Symmetry: C2
Subunit: 284 residues, 2 copies
């Protein structure tokens, strides 16, 4: 079947990594939800802004497909940039929209997990003193509404680069939010924390970069697959990624990158044809 994963949070969940700084992930077994149905995943996955880029859900799915050669993983993009915990209130629009997206997804897939990452917009002037209780109502409503009382919900921490440079300089209370995120995970059932140590950011000083967003996805899967808290970065983080990048592509996959090259006008029709035949004639 199709195992779907709901994506919730701020811009760091939707992904802002520069897609030209990390290798493309073309996995015919990884899919994204486009206006209610499944389509082959191609970053930007969570296109909430014209600037959406590399997400952590990319490597998460790639790593997931390697541990499950049989099924297909479906991603449900519902992250909103700049959104704060208050904007995610049950009565909220971006929460009720996430529900409708999830439901559309589960009428053709099975919701297996929920990926959450948010907190930059709450890393200032207190309001971290109410973050927990706020999150509890959101998670509670999610499990109830979507009828998933025990599926693992993974939550990541905030980058240590916050509260220092430009767009991120206003987030001086990020570490106070991390404590609430951690606490929430330990105390709440079926919730796991994922450290963001070592992760770096783009020039804006607030968004995690592509490279770091790729490692971040592995830690998310590491937590999900083993149902544990990832308090430290995985050791084979770099090599683990290259191992997925080296994977040989299917005929359908390499025909896809070519169909797209042509669709975007990057190559001629005859050049597209010649390239398609090479794939067809190729041995193995």
């Amino acid at each position: 079947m199709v195992k779907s994963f709901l994506m919730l949070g701020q811009s760091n969940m939707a992904g802002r990594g520069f897609i030209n700084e990390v290798p493309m992930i073309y996995n015919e077994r990884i899919q994204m939800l486009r206006n209610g149905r499944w389509q082959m995943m191609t970053e930007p996955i969570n296109y909430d802004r014209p600037v959406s880029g590399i997400s952590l859900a990319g490597s998460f799915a790639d790593a997931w497909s390697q541990k499950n050669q049989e099924d297909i993983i479906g991603l449900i993009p519902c992250a909103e940039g700049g959104s704060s915990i208050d904007e995610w209130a049950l009565d909220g629009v971006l929460f009720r929209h996430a529900l409708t997206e999830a439901k559309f997804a589960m009428e053709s897939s099975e919701l297996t997990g929920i990926l959450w990452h948010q907190g930059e917009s709450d890393s200032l002037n207190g309001n971290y003193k109410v973050y927990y209780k706020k999150l509890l109502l959101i998670i509670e409503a999610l499990r109830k509404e979507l009828n998933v009382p025990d599926i693992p919900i993974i939550i990541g921490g905030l980058g240590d680069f916050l509260g220092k440079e430009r767009f991120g300089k206003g987030c001086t209370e990020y570490n106070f939010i991390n404590k609430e995120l951690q606490k929430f995970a330990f105390e709440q059932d079926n919730c796991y924390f994922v450290t963001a140590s070592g992760l770096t950011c783009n020039p804006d000083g607030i968004h995690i970069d592509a490279i770091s967003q790729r490692k971040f996805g592995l830690r998310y899967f590491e937590a999900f697959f083993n149902r544990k808290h990832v308090l430290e970065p995985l050791i084979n983080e770099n090599e683990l990624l290259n191992l997925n990048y080296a994977r040989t592509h299917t005929k359908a996959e390499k025909i896809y990158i070519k169909s797209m090259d042509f669709a975007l006008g990057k190559i001629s029709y005859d050049e597209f044809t010649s390239e398609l035949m090479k794939i067809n004639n190729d041995l193995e």
Copy 2:
């Protein structure tokens, strides 16, 4: 207030024009729906595929903003590439998803019109003999469900390049669909037809190109604004477009193109700063 317009149809409504072949439209008074709420419009508007590009809704909105300097126009992207009239059935997922999107939009805007363009996937082996009756049920359900019994619904024809080259060669019955589209418009209340004469296509032989997609948008507005059938192309089509391209941008707008240039890594932070001050210091 915010006047919203629901976009329905196939890939030629979602837009597949190459964004690098036509000038960018940056209008702070034109917005798009991103996961339930309004955000400043930036093409691709209807991102249903990683290949989504220039849509006809772009120039439609630009022309609309010039005849209404007071309000803001909101676009609701709900077009699915490759979808056929059958996939748009009331019980369908991409129809029920369009409804939920429209409703989310109207709880913060007023649905003023519906833009429809579809039929390439029905331009083969008959089934054009059932297109009308099929469309009637879809339109009927839309007005009833969304409580908009008299808002103008505009429908465009199919390109004359269809049924001849590559990806479009299979659409040999396009002209039979056009007749049904036309008929439907004349007979049905508050429905207007928009010819696609003169419009050209990209190399794939099936998708209307950026230039043509821009002219196509004007004809849509021409029909909507005057509540009439556009059976011929507008005469000042080219100049009418340049007139909108020449428009001087607002301070907020030019600050936006700069905020994006930086957000995408196209410029340095200091270069971004320097550019922001120039905008601030500028006289008029």
